[PDB]
Write a protein that binds this ligand. Structure first.
Ligand SMILES: Cc1nnc2n1-c1ccc(-c3ccc(N)nc3)cc1N(c1ccc(Cl)cc1)C[C@H]2C
Length: 124
């Protein structure tokens, strides 16, 4: 089956607004969300719907842009590096589950390239 999604809000966690977290939501996430190849990555992988029974046998740290949006907008992250780590986890999952040169791998690679260009611009 599917696991519950990752945790996305917790009112016991301390909250802060930073320039870098603001950029990651308002600029980074937005540009990725509207990319041609964003659609597979906008919500948790639904392994039941897609008939991928081994997806969560292989991928033990799930992540998707939907979850990352929820974490940014709920002030779940304290450090910008947490969010960057989550985007990395998302791309890496796709590379782990799939194989070099698969269509979805090319799409993730191109998304990652745009994420890297956008992070280059992260404000201080
Ligand atoms: C992300 C990711 N990492 N691996 C996968 N995915 C993936 C997630 C969601 C979908 C998907 C597929 C159909 C649909 N209606 N909504 C979402 C397809 C995927 N996959 C996918 C998406 C696009 C293309 Cl062209 C091929 C495979 C394959 C699947 C194993």
């Amino acid at each position: 089956t599917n696991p519950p999604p990752p945790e996305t809000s917790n009112p016991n966690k301390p909250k802060r607004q930073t320039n870098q977290l603001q950029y990651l939501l308002r600029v980074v996430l937005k540009t990725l969300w509207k990319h041609q190849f964003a659609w597979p990555f906008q919500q948790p992988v639904d392994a039941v719907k897609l008939n991928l029974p081994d997806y969560y046998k292989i991928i033990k740290t799930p992540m998707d842009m939907g979850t990352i949006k929820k974490r940014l907008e709920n002030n779940y992250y304290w450090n910008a590096q947490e969010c960057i780590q989550d985007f990395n986890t998302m791309f890496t999952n796709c590379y782990i589950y799939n194989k070099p040169g698969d269509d979805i791998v090319l799409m993730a690679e191109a998304l990652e390239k745009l994420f890297l260009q956008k992070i280059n611009e992260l404000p201080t």
